[PDB]
Amino acid sequence: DIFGAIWPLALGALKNLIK
């Protein structure tokens, strides 16, 4: 299912947090 496009998203969110 949609388990590849939602990955780069959560990763980009944790980056703007403290990265």
Curated annotation (Swiss-Prot):
Protein's UniProt keywords contain Secreted: yes
Residues the record lists as Lysine amide modifications: K19
Keywords: Amidation, Amphibian defense peptide, Antibiotic, Antimicrobial, Cytolysis, Fungicide, Hemolysis, Secreted
GO cellular component: extracellular region
Domain of life: Eukaryota
Example of a GO biological process term: killing of cells of another organism
Compartments where located: Secreted
Predominant location: secreted
Tissue-wise expression: Expressed by the skin glands.
Transmembrane segments: none
Role of this protein: Has antibacterial activity against the Gram-positive bacteria S.aureus ATCC 25926 (MIC=8 uM), E.faecalis ATCC 29212 (MIC=16 uM), and B.subtilis ATCC 19659 (MIC=8 uM). Has a less potent antibacterial activity against the Gram-negative bacteria E.coli ATCC 25922 (MIC=32 uM), and P.aeruginosa ATCC 27853 (MIC=64 uM). Has antifungal activity against C.albicans ATCC 90028 (MIC=16.7 uM), C.krusei ATCC 6258 (MIC=16.7 uM), C.parapsilosis ATCC 22019 (MIC=67 uM), and C.neoformans ATCC 90012 (MIC=33.5 uM). Has hemolytic activity against human erythrocytes (HC50=18 uM).
UniProt protein name: Hylin-a1
Taxonomic source organism: Boana albopunctata (Spotted tree frog)
